[PDB]
Amino acid sequence: MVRSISSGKSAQFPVLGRTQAAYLAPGENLDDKRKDIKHTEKVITIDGL
Amino acid sequence: MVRSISSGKSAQFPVLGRTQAAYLAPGENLDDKRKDIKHTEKVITIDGL
Amino acid sequence: LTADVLIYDIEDAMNHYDVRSEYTSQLGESLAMAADGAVLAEIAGLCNVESKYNENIEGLGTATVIETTQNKAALTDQVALGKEIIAALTKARAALTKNYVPAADRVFYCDPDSYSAILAALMPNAANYAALIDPEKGSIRNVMGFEVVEVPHLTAGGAGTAREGTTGQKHVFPANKGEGNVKVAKDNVIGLFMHRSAVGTVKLRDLALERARRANFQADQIIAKYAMGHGGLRPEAAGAVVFKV
Amino acid sequence: ESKYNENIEGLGTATVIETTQNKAALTDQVALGKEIIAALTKARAALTKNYVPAADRVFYCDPDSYSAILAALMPNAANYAALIDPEKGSIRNVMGFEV
Amino acid sequence: ASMTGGQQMGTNQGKGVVAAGDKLALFLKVFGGEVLTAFARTSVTTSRH
Amino acid sequence: ASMTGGQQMGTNQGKGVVAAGDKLALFLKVFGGEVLTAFARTSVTTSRH
Numbered sequence: 448m449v450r451s452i453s454s455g456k457s458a459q460f461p462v463l464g465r466t467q468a469a470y471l472a473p474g475e476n477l478d479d480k481r482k483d484i485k486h487t488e489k490v491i492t493i494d495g496l
Numbered sequence: 497m498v499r500s501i502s503s504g505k506s507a508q509f510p511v512l513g514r515t516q517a518a519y520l521a522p523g524e525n526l527d528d529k530r531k532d533i534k535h536t537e538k539v540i541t542i543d544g545l
Numbered sequence: 546l547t548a549d550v551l552i553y554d555i556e557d558a559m560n561h562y563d564v565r566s567e568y569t570s571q572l573g574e575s576l577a578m579a580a581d582g583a584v585l586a587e588i589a590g591l592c593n594v595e596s597k598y599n600e601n602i603e604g605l606g607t608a609t610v611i612e613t614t615q616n617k618a619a620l621t622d623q624v625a626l627g628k629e630i631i632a633a634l635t636k637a638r639a640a641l642t643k644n645y646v647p648a649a650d651r652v653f654y655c656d657p658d659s660y661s662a663i664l665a666a667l668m669p670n671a672a673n674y675a676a677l678i679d680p681e682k683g684s685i686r687n688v689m690g691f692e693v694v695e696v697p698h699l700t701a702g703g704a705g706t707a708r709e710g711t712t713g714q715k716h717v718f719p720a721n722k723g724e725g726n727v728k729v730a731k732d733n734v735i736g737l738f739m740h741r742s743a744v745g746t747v748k749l750r751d752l753a754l755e756r757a758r759r760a761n762f763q764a765d766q767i768i769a770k771y772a773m774g775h776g777g778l779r780p781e782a783a784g785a786v787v788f789k790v
Numbered sequence: 791e792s793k794y795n796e797n798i799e800g801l802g803t804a805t806v807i808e809t810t811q812n813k814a815a816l817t818d819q820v821a822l823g824k825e826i827i828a829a830l831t832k833a834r835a836a837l838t839k840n841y842v843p844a845a846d847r848v849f850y851c852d853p854d855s856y857s858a859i860l861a862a863l864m865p866n867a868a869n870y871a872a873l874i875d876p877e878k879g880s881i882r883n884v885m886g887f888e889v
Numbered sequence: 890a891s892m893t894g895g896q897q898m899g900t901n902q903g904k905g906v907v908a909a910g911d912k913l914a915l916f917l918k919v920f921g922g923e924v925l926t927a928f929a930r931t932s933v934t935t936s937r938h
Numbered sequence: 939a940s941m942t943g944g945q946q947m948g949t950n951q952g953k954g955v956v957a958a959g960d961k962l963a964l965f966l967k968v969f970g971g972e973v974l975t976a977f978a979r980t981s982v983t984t985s986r987h
Contacts, residue, residue: 470543475891476890478890478892504917507920512569516548517575518727520547520770523944527962529708530551584934657839662839664835669870670824680884681885683886698890781976840928842928
C-alpha cells in the first residue's frame with residue numbers, strides 16, 4: 448500500500464485497540480470501570496536525494 | 497439456530513423419547529405392563545445485561 | 546403385537562402445548578422399527594444357526610464365511626479392518642454365486658462403525674486412486690452389486706414378552722458365540738447380506754390404532770396394533786460376515 | 791459430567807480419544823493430520839449411530855488444527871488429491887460436515 | 890461503588906425471608922414456544938422384501 | 939394377572955384327545971402367492987467354441 452503526500456518532513460498514522468465488553472450487575476453503576484481504546488500513533492521518515 | 501422469547505426470566509423445554517414394542521399373548525392383561533416414556537426438562541437462563 | 550400409552554385428564558389438564566399426536570407418531574415408529582429389527586434378527590439367525598438342516602437335498606448351504614486374523618479387539622485401528630471388510634465382501638460374492646442367485650439385485654447390511662471402517666478403508670490417505678467413493682456425504686456409491694443401508698439398530702429386534710428388552714423375546718439373537726453349538730452371535734458379527742426372498746413377511750389385519758376412553762381411572766388410552774409373520778425361505782441365498790474365534 | 795446423560799436413551803454424546811501420546815511425542819504435524827482425519831471419520835460414526843439427520847452439520851476446530859489438516863492432505867502423504875483446492879486455503883466439505 | 894434507591898424489581902423481600910442474595914428469585918418462565926420431539930428415527934427395509 | 943376362559947377357536951379339543959397339550963391351532967394353513975422354482979442356470983459355454 449502506497450500513498451503520495453507533499454510538504455513536510457514526515458508522515459504519521461494512528462491505530463486502535465478493538466476493545467472487549469463485560470457484564471453489568473443489576474442496579475449498579477458503570478462509572479466504576481471502563482478502559483478506552485488506547486489509540487497510539489506511528490511515523491515514517493523521508494530520507495533525501 | 498436461535499429463537500426469541502419475551503417477558504419472563506428463563507426458557508424451559510420439554511423432551512420425550514422412544515418406546516419399546518411388545519407382544520400380546522391372548523388372552524392377557526394389556527394394562528399389566530407399561531414403561532411410561534416419561535419426560536424431562538431443559539432449562540436455559542438469560543444471564544443479564 | 547403392539548404397544549400403547551394412556552393419558553390422565555388431570556395431568557393433561559395443567560401443562561403447556563398438546564402432545565396426543567407425536568405420541569401416535571412414536572407408536573407407529575416403535576412398531577415399524579420393531580418389525581425391521583425382528584426381520585434382520587430372523588435372516589441372521591434362522592437362515593444360519595440351524596444345525597445339520599440345510600435347504601432341500603441339493604447342498605445350497607448359506608454358509609457365511611470366517612475372517613482374517615482374530616480377536617474382535619485385535620485392531621481398533623479403523624484401517625487394516627475395512628480392507629478385510631472389502632476382502633470379506635468379495636468372498637460374499639463368491640459364496641453367493643455358487644447358488645446361482647442372479648441379476649446383481651443383491652443387498653447388504655452393516656452396523657454404523659463398520660460402515661465407517663469401510664469409509665476409513667478408502668480415504669484420501671493411504672489406499673490409492675479414487676474409485677468407488679466420494680467425500681462429503683458418504684453414500685459410498687456401490688461395490689460388487691450389494692449396497693450398504695447403514696442400520697444403527699443391530700441385534701435386538703426381539704420385542705417379545707414384557708416392554709423391557711429382556712426375558713424371553715420371540716425372534717432372538719443368541720448372547721454368546723461358542724456355547725455348545727451356534728454360529729452368528731451378538732459379540733462377534735459384522736454384516737448381513739441377502740438378495741431378497743431370501744426372506745418373507747405376510748401381513749393380516751393391516752395396521753391401525755384406536756382411542757378408548759377409560760372410566761375408573763378417569764383417563765383415556767391410545768393403542769396401535771398389528772399382526773404379521775416372519776419366516777425364512779430359500780436359504781440358498783443368505784448369510785453373514787463374522788470375526789474369527 | 792460423568793453421569794447425567796439426559797434421560798436414559800441412545801444419546802451418549804461421545805468424545806473421541808487418540809493414539810501415540812498427547813502433544814509430546816505426537817507432532818511432526820503430518821502424523822496428527824492423518825490420525826485426526828481418521829478421528830473425524832470415527833466421530834461421524836459415533837454421531838450417526840444416534841441417528842440425527844444426514845448432512846446439515848458443522849465442524850469447529852482451531853486454526854492450528856485446520857492448517858494441520860491442510861498440511862496433512864496435499865503433498866507427500868495422500869494420493870489422488872480429493873476434498874481440497876490445492877491453490878487455495880478453503881477446504882470443501884469432507885465427510886457430511888462443514889469445516 | 891454503586892447507586893442507591895435500589896428497587897430491584899424481582900426479589901423476595903417480604904417480612905422475614907432475609908437470605909441476603911439471589912436477586913432473581915420470583916419471575917415467570919415462558920418456555921420456548923417450541924418442544925424438542927424425540928429425534929426422528931426412520932427405518933430401512935421398507936422396500937427390498 | 940390373566941383371564942381363564944375365552945372362545946379360543948384354536949386348541950380343537952375333542953372327546954378322545956388325551957391330554958393333547960395346549961397348542962395353536964386347529965384352523966387351516968393356506969398357500970399363498972407363487973411357488974419357488976429353483977434358479978435356472980446360464981448357457982455359459984457352447985455359445986463360443
